[PDB]
Design a protein around this ligand. Structure first.
Ligand SMILES: *[C@@H]1O[C@H](CO)[C@@H](O[C@@H]2O[C@H](CO)[C@@H](O)[C@H](O)[C@H]2NC(C)=O)[C@H](O)[C@H]1NC(C)=O
Lengths: 123, 107, 197
């Protein structure tokens, strides 16, 4: 269960960014992916959840209608697309893999289990 | 952060320290709250899930419980190398994964 | 009229059953007064899928079943044909075709002690969608994926019963609601339950 991330370079406000999380050591198609962020001087804040099938997904209120979450099982990759950023969006973004096998649509038993390396983003 | 937590806590090494996480009835009640720890400059790790369970490789010192619209965590035999921020995260009934403000622990 | 039905026993009760094992009472051989219970406005929601409630006393049946349990005030709508969720999917599902009434009334004062009640548990994570009118007291640890848990708990193995967080102050949403379902059945034997003559 090894998770890595890439992207999130120094980008000025109003531009678009793509973050790629790569996973290994398990079946990437049997788990629901989580995206979260850690802002300086603030507690961890959830960003979004994407189901393994991609049919069902949810976003946090702050980032709603200005972002996209996608997953490629064949390449075992997780893409986060951000557009129209702002000052507060600057944070270390993290990709997390649930351990519980997907067996329905509950989204409260699905845990933010072992974490990824995460990458900084500055707006 | 709908959840509320004490700004910080500390104590001697080994008096069974406790940390309380408070939230409404739509975040930590009728759902589950998981507790993670964040080391300074290191990736967070899972400590307690489902309010009582524990993952492999985590010692028996950490324990957790829920008492209605609020949860608590207990660390017995605290060592000096447990400095980290403890976060309690629960699923809001509607769409959210509410996170706690944090708990800066010191020895 | 000589003898009346025991609606008081199933309505005014202190020890009131939970949802995952909903209490079932069989009523027959007695005259039932539906007008008295309908006129009273104490009942928050009084729906009747079938015959009109006001004419209930004009109908005769051979058996009626009084199901009873407690649920969150928010999800009281789930007790009705068709609707699906966490109560009508894994706990208590009515058939698509229905004939009974569904009384549901608030009971915040009578329950939800200061420190919490915790006496009401609801099922969760059922293996398959529940067929109509089935109760499953089984507490066997749930499983998914492929690995079977040997009576232990962890990832992929859950405890199917979850307790409510009833408190004296929670809002009209997450407050206890006592629900009683009066399902009639014509069957074939001569009708017994009827209205006053
Ligand atoms: C359940 O108890 C309540 C409260 O006692 C009943 O409502 C009224 O109670 C008073 C005294 O307790 C009686 O004098 C009234 O006659 C009751 N109302 C009616 C319409 O009879 C309530 O009736 C009881 N439940 C049933 C099915 O009778």
């Amino acid at each position: 269960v090894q998770l890595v991330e890439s992207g999130g370079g120094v980008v000025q406000p109003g531009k678009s960014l793509r973050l790629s999380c790569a996973a290994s050591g398990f079946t990437f198609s049997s788990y629901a992916m989580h995206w979260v962020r850690l802002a300086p001087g603030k507690g961890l804040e959830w960003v979004a959840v994407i189901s393994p099938d991609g049919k069902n997904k949810y976003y946090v209120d702050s980032v709603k209608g200005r972002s996209t979450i996608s997953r490629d099982n064949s390449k075992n990759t997780l893409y986060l697309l951000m557009n129209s950023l702002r000052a507060e969006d600057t944070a270390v973004y993290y990709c997390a893999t649930t351990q519980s096998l997907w067996f329905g649509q509950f989204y409260y038993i699905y845990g933010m289990d072992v974490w990824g390396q995460g990458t900084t983003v500055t707006v | 952060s709908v959840l509320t937590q004490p700004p910080s806590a500390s104590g001697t090494p080994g008096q069974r320290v406790t940390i309380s996480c408070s939230g409404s009835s739509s975040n930590i009640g009728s759902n589950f709250v998981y507790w993670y720890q964040h080391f300074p400059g290191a990736a967070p790790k899972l400590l307690i899930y489902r309010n009582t369970l524990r993952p492999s490789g985590v010692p028996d010192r950490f324990s957790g419980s829920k008492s209605g619209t609020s949860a608590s965590l207990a660390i017995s035999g605290l060592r000096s190398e447990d400095e980290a921020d403890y976060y309690c995260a629960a699923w809001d009934d509607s769409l959210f994964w509410v996170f706690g403000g944090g708990t800066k622990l010191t020895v | 009229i000589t003898n009346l039905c025991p609606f008081g026993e199933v309505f005014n009760a202190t020890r009131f059953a939970s949802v995952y094992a909903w209490n079932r009472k069989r009523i027959s051989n007695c005259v039932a007064d539906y007008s008295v219970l309908y006129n009273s406005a104490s009942f928050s929601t009084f729906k009747c899928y079938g015959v009109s409630p006001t004419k209930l006393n004009d109908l005769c049946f051979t058996n009626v079943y009084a199901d009873s349990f407690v649920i969150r005030g928010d999800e009281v709508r789930q007790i009705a044909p068709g609707q699906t969720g966490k109560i009508a999917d894994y706990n208590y599902k009515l058939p698509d075709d229905f004939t009974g009434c569904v009384i549901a009334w608030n009971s915040n004062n009578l329950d939800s002690k200061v420190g919490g009640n915790y006496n009401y548990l609801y099922r969760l994570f059922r293996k398959s969608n529940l067929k109509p009118f089935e109760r499953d007291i089984s507490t066997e640890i749930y499983q998914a994926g492929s690995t079977p848990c040997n009576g232990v708990e962890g990832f992929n193995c859950y405890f199917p019963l979850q307790s409510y967080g009833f408190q004296p102050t929670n809002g009209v949403g997450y407050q206890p609601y006592r629900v009683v379902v009066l399902s009639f059945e014509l069957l074939h034997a001569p009708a017994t339950v009827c209205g006053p003559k």
